């Protein structure tokens, strides 16, 4: 591929001449990524000479259960291969989609990034692995199937995709801006977001479990239900207005540790920034 | 097994004397299927001499990212092993369940086919991988568990299964016709269908995301919610009556490309067939 | 690890000096478990000399499709490695969580046991694999993210976790008793239980599909919906009172086979124990 995966971005910044020790049975995709480096099956590992790469999450659990792993820092010294959505201490990219710091999501949102459904994902955003993000099929035609186009010749493909781009309900997310997910967002298990109608999820939004959101979620609102309805705002109006332009999620690691009291007490946060 | 898998049906029609090149680390099930053929780890692949079989979907993505793959047509020259529900250009079978053309579904619906819960799946049907199809346990007894029968002797098993067949609410889908899923059907993510009470899903039906359907879905109806309620019909009544017996989903690949305008414009479809 | 996995508990009781035959490609975790025993790739298997261990569930299906498997009893002679939640004929443990007999659950509930969210799981309980059990993040602060704490030093971690323990809404299930799931419970697909607010699920409870439960479920109640509401009780009040202290789920395998008629007919059950 032309766009670097999460494993390749981590290695580019933290490997630093060491050889990669593979903790687990590798995939063909992994062997292609490790081709330029020296790599081997992990036996005796030393973080001064080695960088452990666990193939799967279950292989990571086995590695952390090993006594050899407690001299290995999270991303500086190891990583999970099959974890494109895993959180990171630095801003990264996922199929031309910027992902903030300490932001994690599941395989469904990863596939949504590759489909072009997402424009950006904020910092300190927590998304459950079971969450799904898909677009709508076309509804202005006699059929709803998408793989019917596998039978169209050119002449038929040109006219089918012609109406697709000229559709105000955005089938396959064709005619809309890619959806943005803000910072400090929480998304629960079994949640769903429609990539055809949702174009923005505000910062600090909370999506309940089993919730099916079909429209935009304003910042710091808690949407819940099937379909998702706003049941309560997370903060007061004055806080949401202030929080939107102070942007604590863009602070440095030292500045977050300086204003712990402001981030911990919401009543103190307004006092310092209202 | 006695019933051919999707990989075996594809190979039986398109392999044509070539040897299989395995793109990825194979499973024991795959090695059993490839036993009669000549097979090897894929290196340099040529579609005139080789047929690429990617073990998993992630191995398929790695194969398509390789320059060698662009002389390989979808099913005629490659396929994914762990993809029993993947779409195909020809009608196939899945555990004694006929599956139409360009119809795809996930692992939960595959397991539903093997359980005998499904009778047939139409053509050009799109089912999300997260969709689940299960039956109800028995409710006319003091227990709801199913694996309690692991402790029954013969005498106890005969009487337990005796009432199971004599139950009008169809526990474990015992006393009903297997459920039929029509053509041009769309099923969203996190959807659920009760195999104990649902016996038919009409052609052209649309099941929303997170929807739990518990009764039959009439053709070209859009069921939505927990539980699923009909919120709107996809087409006018006159169209549904006409569409049910013209059956465009049974047209040839040449006839679909002949009547693209009818399938693309619903207003034109009635003009040509009303 | 210090706590035995489900595979290690089964082997400790049923292996009995035999060598393990691995049906499938093993993981690194599996190789660590089989280290003290003699093990090999399964070829010709005899239950008098061998104990088959299928790595994955798909490898189990391949094994049962083999003619060699029909002299192998379920747990006494084989088992699936990647199946920590699979049912068993004897009471077992899962990350310091007692699991009853013939009780099965999915990977999400397994991870919930390791997180400390569950105290015990009853006997003859049926939980769907797609079910999820998670706790709530903190809501009394300006942020909702959990992995923000990866940036806190000591001083910041001590004060963040300080309010976490002093929170009546139980973020991360910090200040509550671990949730108990009773016996003869049925949980459907796509179900969700909030580990932060739910502390008990009574015996004989039934959770419908796609249901999001947020409070305790009384014994023998059927909760349904988003959010889950009690729609109907499974039995009469007099039965629930009697069933709660006869505890048929604690009977021996011989006593279950003695009182099949009582367990099969609910009307007969009260006659014998009311
Ligand atoms: C969304 C959530 C944070 C709400 O937390 P909360 O502040 O304690 O909400 P409350 O318990 O006070 O109840 C608020 C109302 O909204 C409803 N509600 C809240 N969360 C709901 C949910 N997931 N689903 C359905 N209804 C919900 C409640 O039924 C309640 O109804 P009411 O208006 O009649 O009182 C929490 O319930 C939740 O579901 N978090 C997601 C859990 C998860 O999936 N984690 C995995 C991802 S890490
Ligand atoms: C079902 C679906 C096609 C409806 O499309 P639509 O024609 O644009 O429906 P609308 O947006 O006009 O809204 C219709 C009504 O039904 C509701 N509704 C529609 N889809 C819903 C859904 N999945 N869940 C809950 N409610 C839904 C809407 O809330 C709305 O309510 P209203 O009567 O008060 O106005 C679409 O919403 C959907 O969910 N598709 C499934 C997406 C998916 O899961 N893809 C993965 C599988 S490939
Ligand atoms: C929960 C369940 C056992 C109810 O069975 P039941 O006794 O036949 O319930 P009924 O069909 O008589 O309907 C009862 C009412 O509750 C509703 N209801 C029942 N189950 C529901 C469900 N999963 N979701 C939403 N609504 C449900 C029905 O819509 C109905 O509504 P009403 O009050 O207007 O009549 C069953 O519907 C179910 O969903 N089982 C879980 C299936 C599953 O997920 N299996 C996989 C795990 S092994
Ligand atoms: N290109 C996105 C892909 O998404 C995959 O995950 C999901 C889907 O994108 C994937 O797509 C299915 C596919 O199974 C099947 N073989 C073909 C079918 N047309 C697709 O259907 C789906 O994907 C396409 C996007 O390409 C959408 O246009 C369509 O609306 C949607 N139903 O099925 C998976 C479960 O629904 C993988 N995560 C990933 O390998 C890949 O990035
Ligand atoms: N035979 C169907 C199987 O379905 C599997 O997928 C799902 C279930 O069928 C499977 O079945 C579970 C099983 O985990 C566990 N080891 C035993 C338990 N009795 C089963 O329970 C389930 O399956 C049976 C059907 O056999 C139903 O009667 C029962 O109502 C249902 N709860 O758990 C999986 C998640 O719920 C596999 N896709 C597939 O290997 C296999 O075909
Ligand atoms: N320690 C529990 C783990 O749960 C895992 O499954 C699920 C989660 O526990 C897991 O945790 C995610 C994780 O993906 C990501 N790398 C880090 C993130 N902080 C976690 O987030 C989640 O887990 C933690 C519990 O540790 C909760 O406090 C948090 O509320 C929750 N959002 O993401 C998975 C899907 O949501 C695995 N089943 C298992 O390896 C492991 O036991």
């Amino acid at each position: 591929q032309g766009m670097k995966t999460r494993l390749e971005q981590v290695l580019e910044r933290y490997l630093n001449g060491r050889e990669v020790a593979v903790w687990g049975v590798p995939t063909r995709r992994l062997l292609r990524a490790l081709k330029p480096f020296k790599f081997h099956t992990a036996d005796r590992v030393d973080p001064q000479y080695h960088y452990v790469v666990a193939v799967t999450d279950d292989d990571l659990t086995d590695f952390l259960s090993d006594e050899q792993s407690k001299s290995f820092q999270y991303a500086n010294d190891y990583l999970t291969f099959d974890d494109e959505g895993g959180e990171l201490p630095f801003e990264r990219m996922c199929f031309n989609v910027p992902v903030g710091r300490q932001t994690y999501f599941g395989d469904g949102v990863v596939g949504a990034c590759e489909n072009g459904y997402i424009k950006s994902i904020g910092q300190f955003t927590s998304i459950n692995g079971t969450a799904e993000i898909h677009a709508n099929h076309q509804l202005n035609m006699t059929f709803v199937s998408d793989d019917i186009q596998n039978f169209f010749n050119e002449e038929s493909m040109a006219v089918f995709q012609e109406k697709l781009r000229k559709d105000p309900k955005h089938p396959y997310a064709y005619s809309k801006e890619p959806m943005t997910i803000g910072s400090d967002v929480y998304i629960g298990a079994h949640a769903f977001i429609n990539a055809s109608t949702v174009t923005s999820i505000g910062d600090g939004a909370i999506i309940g479990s089993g919730a099916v959101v079909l429209e935009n979620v304003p910042p710091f609102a808690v949407v819940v239900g099937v379909p998702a309805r706003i049941k309560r705002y997370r903060f007061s109006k004055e806080m949401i207005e202030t929080l939107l332009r102070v942007k604590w999620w863009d602070w440095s690691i030292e500045e977050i540790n300086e204003n712990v009291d402001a981030l911990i007490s919401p009543e103190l946060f307004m006092k310092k920034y209202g």
Side-chain angles (χ1 to χ4, degrees), chain A residues 96-151:
Chain A
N96 224 288
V97 174
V99 175
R101 303 172 300 176
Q102 311 290 349
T103 294
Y104 56 99
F105 41 89
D107 257 351
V109 172
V110 175
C113 294
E114 191 204 306
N115 278 340
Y117 295 162
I118 303 176
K119 199 201 297 222
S120 78
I121 305 182
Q123 310 204 59
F124 305 98
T125 287
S126 320
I127 299 173
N128 187 266
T130 53
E132 295 287 327
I133 293 177
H134 290 281
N136 288 332
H137 284 195
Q138 80 288 327
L139 322 171
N140 46 357
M141 330 204 183
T142 327
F143 60 93
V144 74
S145 143
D146 64 321
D147 281 309
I148 177 174
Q149 68 198 131
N150 285 328
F151 284 150

Side-chain angles (χ1 to χ4, degrees), chain A residues 23 45 52 60-73 77-78:
Chain A
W23 202 277
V45 281
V52 166
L60 176 58
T61 311
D62 188 76
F63 172 57
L64 299 183
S65 85
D66 200 309
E67 43 152 59
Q68 302 186 75
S69 55
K70 302 300 75 173
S71 27
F72 285 76
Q73 223 262 324
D77 300 314
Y78 71 84

Side-chain angles (χ1 to χ4, degrees), chain A residues 4-273:
Chain A
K4 317 196 185 164
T5 81
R6 183 191 95 118
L7 175 68
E8 309 185 285
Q9 289 173 67
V10 169
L11 280 184
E12 275 182 351
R13 192 203 272 230
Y14 289 135
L15 183 63
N16 297 358
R18 300 175 289 182
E19 326 159 293
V20 161
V22 188
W23 202 277
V25 47
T27 65
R28 213 181 200 281
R29 167 56 213 176
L30 176 56
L31 295 175
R32 182 193 286 272
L34 301 185
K35 200 168 166 36
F37 318 100
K38 256 162 177 130
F39 64 102
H40 58 90
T41 324
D43 196 356
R44 299 321 271 179
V45 281
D46 180 15
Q48 186 183 336
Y49 302 95
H50 302 127
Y51 187 97
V52 166
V53 170
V55 198
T56 74
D57 272 324
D58 279 354
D59 289 327
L60 176 58
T61 311
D62 188 76
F63 172 57
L64 299 183
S65 85
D66 200 309
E67 43 152 59
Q68 302 186 75
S69 55
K70 302 300 75 173
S71 27
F72 285 76
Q73 223 262 324
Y74 169 56
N76 300 73
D77 300 314
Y78 71 84
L79 207 77
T80 296
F81 160 76
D82 199 13
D83 200 22
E84 183 67 23
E87 83 280 352
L88 278 183
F90 59 94
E91 316 198 70
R92 74 162 182 285
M93 293 263 316
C94 178
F95 301 96
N96 224 288
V97 174
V99 175
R101 303 172 300 176
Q102 311 290 349
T103 294
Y104 56 99
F105 41 89
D107 257 351
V109 172
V110 175
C113 294
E114 191 204 306
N115 278 340
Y117 295 162
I118 303 176
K119 199 201 297 222
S120 78
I121 305 182
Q123 310 204 59
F124 305 98
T125 287
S126 320
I127 299 173
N128 187 266
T130 53
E132 295 287 327
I133 293 177
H134 290 281
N136 288 332
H137 284 195
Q138 80 288 327
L139 322 171
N140 46 357
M141 330 204 183
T142 327
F143 60 93
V144 74
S145 143
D146 64 321
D147 281 309
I148 177 174
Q149 68 198 131
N150 285 328
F151 284 150
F152 297 164
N153 60 27
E154 177 37 291
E155 326 184 291
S156 324
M157 181 70 49
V159 49
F160 168 59
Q161 314 249 72
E162 168 67 309
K163 174 158 47 160
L164 275 180
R165 339 184 200 101
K166 269 161 247 188
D167 194 337
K169 282 175 110 192
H170 303 302
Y172 311 99
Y174 253 32
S175 326
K176 42 163 310 206
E177 292 283 351
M179 149 204 306
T180 50
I181 302 164
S183 278
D184 195 39
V185 184
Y186 186 89
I187 300 181
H190 300 314
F192 176 76
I193 310 169
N194 206 288
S196 261
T197 69
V198 172
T199 182
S200 92
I201 288 205
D203 310 283
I206 295 193
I207 302 195
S209 297
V212 179
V213 323
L214 291 323
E215 307 251 61
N216 294 331
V217 177
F220 301 92
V222 193
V223 301
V224 152
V226 177
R229 305 278 137 223
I230 296 191
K231 283 304 235 73
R232 140 212 162 196
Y233 269 80
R234 180 154 139 245
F235 289 141
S236 91
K237 207 291 207 202
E238 284 69 72
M239 184 102 97
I240 307 173
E241 186 158 86
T242 321
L243 264 171
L244 226 37
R245 52 125 191 108
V246 48
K247 296 148 165 4
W248 64 262
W249 41 83
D250 287 329
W251 291 346
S252 95
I253 310 164
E254 169 186 83
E255 310 188 11
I256 275 165
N257 261 20
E258 257 160 41
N259 309 20
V260 193
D261 324 74
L263 286 161
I264 271 188
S265 315
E267 182 204 41
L268 199 172
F269 185 87
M270 287 283 288
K271 205 159 280 213
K272 268 190 73 34
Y273 301 100

